[PDB]
Every structure is written in C-alpha cells, then in structure tokens.
C-alpha cells in the first residue's frame, strides 16, 4: 500500500566530468565576492590521482603560453558552470586519497598561480598542520612522491639559500617518512643522463633558469648555500638577478640496507596535482522517486534526514551566474547551452508525467517488494537522499517506464 511519488530539486549529486570556466582579474570573467556553504553528516571519497582538473589546467596553461604574439603568475580560478558544483575536502589530515568528512561546497575555487617547476614547488599553497605525503602507491611503485611542507623556505637566484631551514626541513621530512619506510632514509642526487628532468627548471620574468640542486640533496650546510645556475642561451659567472621566491613542496622518487630517495623526475602535471588535491567536480541530479501514502543553498539539505531535506525545498532556484554584461567566450557559452538542454530534458520528463510543472506530484504506480524491502520509517526518516538514490539507481529505468505507461494508460 505504498505509491510512487516524484520529487524535483532534491540534493543528490554524483561524480562526473565537465569543462570549467576561467576566472581572473581568451577567458577573463571578473570574479566578485565569493561564498562557502558548509555541509553536514556527509562523507566524500576523494581521489586526486584520478582527478580531471589537471588535464584542463594543463591545456589552459599551454594555450596561454602559446599566445605570445611580463608573464608574472596571477591568481587564476577555475569556476564551475551552471548545474555543477565544487566540493572541497577540508580534513586536517587528508593525505590525498580515501574517505573524508567535513566536506564543504564552494561556488568555485581559490587563487591558483600557474608556475612551472621541477624537483621543487615554488610559491604553492602551504600545508595546514603537518608534513603531508602524497602518493598513489606508497608501498611499492615507480611513481612519484609529493612531500607537502608546513614550514616554508625562502630561495633567491646563482641561487642563494639559508641552510638552517633546509637542515630543519630535511630532518622533519626524514622523520615523517620514518614510519612509512622501515629502512634508514638517505638522499642521493638524481644521477640522471641529462638536465631535462634532473635539474631545477623555472622562469623569472621571461628568463629561463636551469639551477643546479645537487648540493641540497647529498649523503653540513656550513652557512649560506650557494648554487651554480645557468641561463638558456639562444642561438658565464652570472645568475643573480634579484629573483626571490618561496619553496613549499618537494618531489621525491623511490628506488628498488638503507632506503634511498632520488629527487626530480616526473612530469609537469604532477607539480599541479599538488595544488588541486583538495577539490572535486560534481554534478547534481535534481530528480528522485520515493514511496509515500499519497494516491492520485540548494545543497545544505544533503547529508540531513530524508524528511528534513524533503521539506526545505522551495522554488527560489530560477533555473536548474554572478558576472553580467560581458563577453561570453566559447567555453562559457558551451557550458550554458549544455545546462539549458539538460534543464529542458528534465522539464520534458516532468511534463510527460502528471507533475506538469509542479515540484511534488502523486502517480498511480504501486510500490513493490523488490525495488526495496525496507520499512517506511527506514526509508523516510533515517537515510540521506544520496544513499537512497545510490541504492535505487538499479531500477530507475524500470520505474520511469512503468510511470510513463501508467500515465499514458489512464
């Protein structure tokens, strides 16, 4: 004696992939005052190694670099389109992969400075509490390890370094890797065959710098550390052009008595997985079915009780943002057209049934003991919308077909 009823606008999301927006102060939409929405009683499984932001930001930086026709990095945001959302894992000890709580929602992201470097992380966002180790396969893999440091270091380039912070940071790093790796930790130069990926590559206002780093990683600082460095000649004793920056993260690689790690290696994208590791792109699915007794910030509700989320929905959502009277650009126009088509498709689904534009309507479709053999109380006052949708997703197509047939046959 339970009847199917249709809700529209419920806070149910799922992992997906889409193209985002530029945001800066090609693609230059102005960014106004932002905001953040906390979430409650929701657990999110994050996996930054399989993220999709990295490829998009790599493509965007390639497009920016090619457009040459001064290039100091500026805080650039990627801002989610209409119909999607950005989820931030704000856990204190979120190593990078796994479940985490205290996940929050943002309309879109914070400032990212596109800076390219290898074997060292420049001007990146600092850690929060402790030294963080990031790796897809820590135990055994020829995959790079990212060490995120809470104590920043200063560098100036001939690079000049203050060896006290380097000694302290190496002590902290080796102690922090001690529990994961039983063998004694020792650091060795890359021992590579060329300087392409075994050196210190970066740029300073149009000048390329290939700076040696073997003195930093060896088997005593003895005061200020001096580093020889070269500039890319275009077809001597130099390297001090007053270029200062901040060292924030290290890239290390393992090797197959004592454990020996080799810095350097990897590609340029892994410099960038270390900045967008907290973030996930998610797609809302504002449609749901539920059994009832009737017969006939848009995401704060998620994580709460079935009924509590059910009663808080309103009509305030006009469609499915901030800037106005500007140039759209190709990417934003594409995203907006896709969003409009998605909304029109959902409206067509509603119109085919008996809701006819209303949010909550009842239909003549009897419930079954095989879609869910759960008590009415269990369904309607103790489980989140997301978990119910995940459990019912197997039979959604059959439910829709039965609903269409019943509406037509009347």
């Amino acid at each position: 004696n339970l009847w199917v009823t249709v809700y529209y606008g419920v806070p149910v999301w799922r992992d997906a992939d889409t193209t985002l927006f530029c945001a800066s102060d090609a693609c230059v939409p102005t960014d106004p005052n932002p905001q953040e929405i906390p979430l409650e009683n929701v657990t999110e499984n994050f996996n930054m190694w399989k993220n999709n932001m990295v490829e998009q930001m790599q493509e965007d930086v390639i497009s920016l670099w090619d457009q040459s026709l001064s290039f100091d990095p500026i805080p650039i945001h990627y801002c989610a389109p209409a119909g999607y959302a950005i989820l931030k894992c704000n856990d204190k000890k979120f190593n990078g992969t796994g479940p985490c709580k205290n996940v929050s929602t943002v309309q879109c992201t914070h400032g990212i400075k596109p800076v390219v470097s290898t074997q060292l992380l420049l001007n990146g966002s600092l850690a929060e509490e402790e030294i963080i180790i990031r790796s897809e396969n820590l135990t055994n893999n020829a995959k790079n390890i990212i060490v995120h440091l809470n104590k920043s270091v200063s560098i100036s380039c001939y690079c000049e370094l203050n060896g006290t912070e380097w000694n302290e940071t190496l002590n902290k790093v080796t102690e922090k890797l001690k529990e994961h790796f039983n063998k004694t930790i020792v650091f060795q130069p890359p021992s590579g065959g060329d300087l392409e990926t075994t050196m210190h590559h970066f740029n300073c206002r149009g000048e390329f710098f290939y700076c040696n780093t073997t003195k930093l990683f060896n088997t005593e600082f003895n005061g200020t550390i001096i580093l020889p460095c070269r500039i890319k000649q275009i077809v001597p004793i130099s390297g001090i052009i007053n270029c200062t920056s901040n060292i924030t993260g290290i890239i290390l690689t393992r090797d197959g008595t004592d454990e020996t790690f080799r810095p350097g290696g990897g590609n340029i994208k892994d410099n960038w997985r270390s900045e967008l590791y907290k973030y996930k792109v998610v797609q809302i699915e504002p449609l749901g079915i539920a059994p009832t007794r009737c017969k006939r910030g848009f995401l704060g509700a998620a994580g709460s009780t079935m009924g509590a989320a059910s009663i808080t929905l309103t009509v305030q959502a006009r469609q499915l943002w901030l800037p106005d009277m500007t140039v759209w650009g190709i990417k934003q126009l594409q995203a907006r057209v896709l969003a409009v088509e998605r909304y029109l498709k959902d409206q067509k689904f509603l119109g085919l049934w008996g809701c006819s534009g209303k949010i909550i309507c009842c239909t003549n479709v009897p419930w079954n003991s095989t879609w869910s053999n759960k008590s009415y109380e269990e369904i309607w006052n103790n489980m989140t919308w997301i978990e119910w949708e995940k459990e019912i997703s197997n039979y959604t197509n059959r439910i829709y077909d039965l609903l269409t047939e019943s509406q037509n046959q009347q």
Partner: antibody
Amino acid sequence: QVQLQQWGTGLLKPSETLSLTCAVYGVSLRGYYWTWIRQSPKKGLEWIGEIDEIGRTKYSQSLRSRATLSIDTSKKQFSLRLTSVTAADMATYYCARWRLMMVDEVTRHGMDVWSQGTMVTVSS
Amino acid sequence: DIVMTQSPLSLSVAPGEAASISCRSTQSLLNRNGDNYLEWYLRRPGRSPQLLIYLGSERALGVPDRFSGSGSGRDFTLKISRVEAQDVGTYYCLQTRQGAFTFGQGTKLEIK
C-alpha cells in the same frame, strides 16, 4: 545522535515573565518543527506551541494571549517568555523536536528526541 | 478543540499475555488519504517520554515489535504482546488533526 539542553530560571515569584532557552546539538534547524509541551502533574502533557526555522509560529488559543516564542539561528537556540504566570499555570517543562515530510501537505510523523527537561516552581 | 478520551484509566496486567488500550475522540480523525492523524507515546517514571507509534500504526526505530496499533475514525487500539520490565509506565494518545492538540488523560500500566 542529536541531543537537547535547556536553560532557565525555574524558581520565580508569581506574576512576571518566565523566560526559558533551549539548544540543540547534533543537527541543524532547517528541516524540522521545534515545539514544546506543558507537563502538569494533573493535566499531563498539553501542546503549547511550535516554531519553524524562519520564525513562523503557531500557538494555542488558550495560551496565545501571554506567550511568546523566538529563534536564534546563530548558535542554534530558541526560547520563550510567558508574561504574568500564575500558580495554576505551571507550564513549559520539556523541549521537543517533531519530524516532517511533504506530499501535497506538511504531514507530521512522530516526535523522537526529548530534552532532559526542567522543573518550574512558583513562589507565594 | 477535540475532547480526547482514553480507557481504561488504570491497568493491571500480568506478564505473559497481551495488553489492550482503547482510545476515542469526538470528531473523526480519518484523513482522506492519510491513514490516521493519531500517535502513541510512552512515559517511564523519571524519564523523558519517547515515541511508540506515529501516524496510524507503523512503529519507529527502537520498537521491540512488542507494541502495535490499529483502529480508525472513532476507536483506536494499542496492543502489547509482552510486558516484562521496560514498557511499564504510562501510555498517552495524541491527536494531531487540526488546531489545538490534546494528549488526554494517560493510562497507567504495571505488573501484578
């Protein structure tokens, strides 16, 4: 696991305002009806009023004249004041929380979580 | 504004068998679609009363399935399969149909 705590006076002389506050820990206020219940030793339980989370209120016609209800969403609290309490009117013992669901109507399931409650006394 | 009635006023139930509580109103409580706008609560001595039955007859979490409800319109009944140690106390009806609500005089249940 949601819990309710209650602060107030309890001991007051007759014929002034009884103000009592109640806080919730464990869930937000967005999707429920927060209500209270008089508990008289001779009248049992009796419904006094309820408030949503945007401030809309519902009272009882017998106690509408001299009772007021209010919400503070900053710290998830809510309180009441009764003007000119009487010895025979010994009210506002427990806090409460009702459950809700919406299909063409705001239907009302049962109320689940209960505060520890407080004892109110009136002097001579 | 419904005068609400419970029966019997006091109960004396021995362990091992069912116990029945009857509960009546003045104006009909049946909903055109909803099953019933009536609820059943239990209060133990010195404890905050909890939920037993909501919106008709379906129980909620924490029930030992030992309590069940039935009835419609005028007569409502609640039956208990077994009474040993924790369901002794006082049972209350609740009319939630319109306007001012009324619990009504409770029913005391104990053991001989």
